[PDB]
Each structure stands twice: as structure tokens, then as C-alpha cells.
Write a structure and sequence with these properties.
Length: 117
């Protein structure tokens, strides 16, 4: 899975090791091995969420097969909100998540695409 987190919290207000803990959490939530989780955190951005520039975070989750239905994503959402609100000390209203299903022919790995691995 691919997790991308944008936040307007400065880098020195983002807990150390967040990207690593997010890997373990994602493994537990999406059911994929932690060594297959990819995380990108981009802090110190200028953001408005729900029209407000108060501290917030946007998370994007992309994966093959496990984020393609409302029922699945409803569950994932619950857990990721729990993890983020705690780690970043943000209210539930200051976080939004977007889910993106991917297919194997879209992922380049070790010089080829996953379709052939």
C-alpha cells in the first residue's frame, strides 16, 4: 500500500518516527505486511481544510484490491482516524482521507511492473 500524508504542522511538531509507526498501523488495518507499506509525509505545507487554516492533515491511501468499496473503506477510515488523531493531536474534523484503488500494471517494481512479478 501507498500512504501519503500532507500536513501544515511544521516538521518539528510532527512526532519522530511517525512514518515508521504508520507502516505498522497500515499493516494491521489493511492486512498487508509492514515491509510492503510505503509512507510519504510532507510537513510544513500551507493548507486549508473545510476552509480553515487551523492545523490539519490529508491522507491518501492507494492499494490493490483492499480499498475499493464503501464497506471496506468505512472500516479503514475508522482505524486511520483513530491513529492520526492520537499521533498528531488533531480533532476528527481536521483530517480527511482519500482512497485510490490501483491495479498491478500501474506499479513499477524493480525495473518491471507487478503484473510480471
Amino acid at each position: 500500500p501507498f500512504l501519503e500524508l500532507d500536513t501544515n504542522l511544521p516538521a518539528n511538531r510532527v512526532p519522530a518516527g511517525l512514518e515508521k509507526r504508520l507502516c505498522a498501523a497500515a499493516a494491521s488495518i489493511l492486512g498487508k505486511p509492514a515491509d510492503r507499506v510505503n509512507v510519504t509525509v510532507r510537513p510544513g505545507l500551507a493548507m486549508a481544510l473545510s476552509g480553515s487554516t487551523e492545523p490539519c492533515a490529508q491522507l491518501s491511501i492507494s492499494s490493490i484490491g483492499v480499498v475499493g468499496t464503501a464497506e471496506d473503506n468505512r472500516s479503514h477510515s475508522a482505524h486511520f482516524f483513530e491513529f492520526l488523531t492520537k499521533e498528531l493531536a488533531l480533532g476528527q474534523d481536521r483530517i480527511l482521507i482519500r482512497f485510490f484503488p490501483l491495479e498491478s500494471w500501474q506499479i513499477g517494481k524493480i525495473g518491471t511492473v507487478m503484473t510480471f512479478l
